């Protein structure tokens, strides 16, 4: 473990808690893409199947269980408990254009042709584009609430910290995974317009307009 990955994991947990607590306390999921929450829960489900085959650490196990529970709970609050405030009419991204090709790519381009590795690869490719329905919803509706932008900031910063972590691991440990890296740069570049707008507008008391 290095500080870049630790801050990255804590930034990811921060985003997940900000969203869950925002929906819970306000009793509303207005402005939130239910489709992106489905994709993030599907990322954790396919990535962490190794909970049954590998033990890295108590931290690694606990973080995995917390991410699965918080992702599934967010989906439960949007689609079941506070479904009266779910804006289905503005969450119109067709997720089939993400799942079917990323599924195809994970089967063809992977480190090993075995079910656990193919499923892990699917989680990596899917995560790179999982936020697309949420950004697409914000551009359609025109605005994003401040708490929603804080959620997007900490979520976007998490995989950016992972890129720094991979430079660190490559230099100090000689470890390199091109699939995680390439997907991680794709994941971060999809936040470029949001980052620019968050720093120049949101951090200056202005409207985030995608």
């Amino acid at each position: 473990m290095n500080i870049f990955r630790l801050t990255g994991d804590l930034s990811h947990l921060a985003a997940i808690i900000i969203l869950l607590l925002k929906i819970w306390k306000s009793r509303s999921c207005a402005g939130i893409s239910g489709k992106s929450q489905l994709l993030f829960a599907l990322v954790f489900t396919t990535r962490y199947l190794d909970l049954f085959t590998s033990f890295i650490s108590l931290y690694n196990t606990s973080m995995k269980l917390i991410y699965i529970a918080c992702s599934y709970a967010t989906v439960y609050l949007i689609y079941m408990k506070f479904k009266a405030t779910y804006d289905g009419n503005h969450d119109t991204f067709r997720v089939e254009f993400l799942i079917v090709p990323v599924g195809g790519l994970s089967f063809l381009v992977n480190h090993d042709f075995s079910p656990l590795e193919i499923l892990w690869t699917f989680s990596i490719y899917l995560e790179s584009v999982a936020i697309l329905p949420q950004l697409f919803m914000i551009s359609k509706t025109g605005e994003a609430e401040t708490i929603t932008t804080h959620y997007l900031f900490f979520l976007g910063l998490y995989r950016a910290l992972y890129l720094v972590n991979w430079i660190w691991r490559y230099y100090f440990e000689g470890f390199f995974d091109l699939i995680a890296v390439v997907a991680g740069v794709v994941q971060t570049v999809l936040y470029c317009d949001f980052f620019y707008l968050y720093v120049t507008k949101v951090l200056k008391g202005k409207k985030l307009s995608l």
Binding site: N60, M63, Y67, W120, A180
Partner: peptide, 5 residues
Amino acid sequence: EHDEL
């Protein structure tokens, strides 16, 4: 092994 999240 995959030791990250």
